[PDB]
Design a protein around this ligand. Structure first.
Ligand SMILES: O=C(Cn1ccc2c(=O)[nH]c(NCc3ccccc3)nc21)Nc1ccncc1Cl
Ligand SMILES: O=C(Cn1ccc2c(=O)[nH]c(NCc3ccccc3)nc21)Nc1ccncc1Cl
Ligand SMILES: [Cl-]
Ligand SMILES: [Cl-]
Lengths: 122, 122
């Protein structure tokens, strides 16, 4: 019965990315080797099984700094964080493996599934 | 060049609504007459010119309680908050006027514009 705004979700995500771009209401720093990335936990939780599981745990939910696995590649992480906030995944031959393995670690199964299709599409 | 996930934004919004439903990482209470509504400021800012303007102001950005104009109808507010988090607007003859006037106050111009089309479509 309700009216559907078909661009509203993407508009929200776009604005949330603009907020990240300005460091407005970001509440966590993700450290990946020597790089740091600020983000909104709510967005992370919405997009990643690893961050969902971390922050739903009232023991961890107020963490302000998350140190990721040192083996994780920051470029892979950065590509996935961009994806979270934009719905666009920058998959390329030079990065498919680091992205796929990072998406496995972050428990982003649709992305991993898409990464497999990409290998299969060559 | 990048791969577009066409359902990702709506999936994010759906998960953010589930987080609200569980009061996970909500950081503001909106008081409207005798009713209270918890929400995420980031979502509010993304969807409303009034909340954007309030919370971008470093003077107001850490407010945990916002008292809205007492004349605002809580049902109208509640319909608009649901819309923010779902992209579905529950517009009905019994509520078009309270929704439109609430959307004016919250500076949700596409919604106001849509409310006018609704009156014109009768
Ligand atoms: O679903 C998410 C995060 N997420 C995104 C893709 C994706 C994924 O592929 N596998 C997982 N495995 C862990 C898990 C599985 C089901 C629900 C929750 C977590 N998790 C993912 N978060 C969420 C769920 C329900 N309510 C609010 C929120 Cl924020
Ligand atoms: O646009 C919004 C909020 N919003 C949603 C619909 C809507 C609206 O119809 N009129 C207004 N008038 C005030 C305004 C006008 C332009 C930008 C910002 C505020 N504001 C709206 N927020 C935002 C913008 C840029 N970067 C990050 C964010 Cl969160
Ligand atoms: Cl801030
Ligand atoms: Cl919480």
């Amino acid at each position: 019965s309700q009216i559907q705004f078909t661009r509203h979700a993407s508009d929200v995500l776009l604005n949330l990315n603009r907020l990240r771009s300005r460091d407005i209401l970001t509440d966590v720093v993700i450290v990946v080797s020597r790089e740091q990335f600020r983000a909104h936990k709510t967005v992370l939780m919405a997009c990643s099984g690893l961050f969902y599981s971390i922050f739903t745990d009232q023991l961890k939910r107020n963490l302000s700094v998350i140190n990721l696995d040192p083996e994780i590649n920051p470029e892979g992480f950065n590509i996935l964080l961009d994806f979270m906030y934009t719905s666009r995944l920058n998959l390329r031959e030079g990065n498919i493996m680091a992205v796929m393995a990072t998406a496995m670690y972050l428990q982003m199964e649709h992305v991993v599934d898409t990464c497999r299709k990409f290998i299969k599409a060559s």
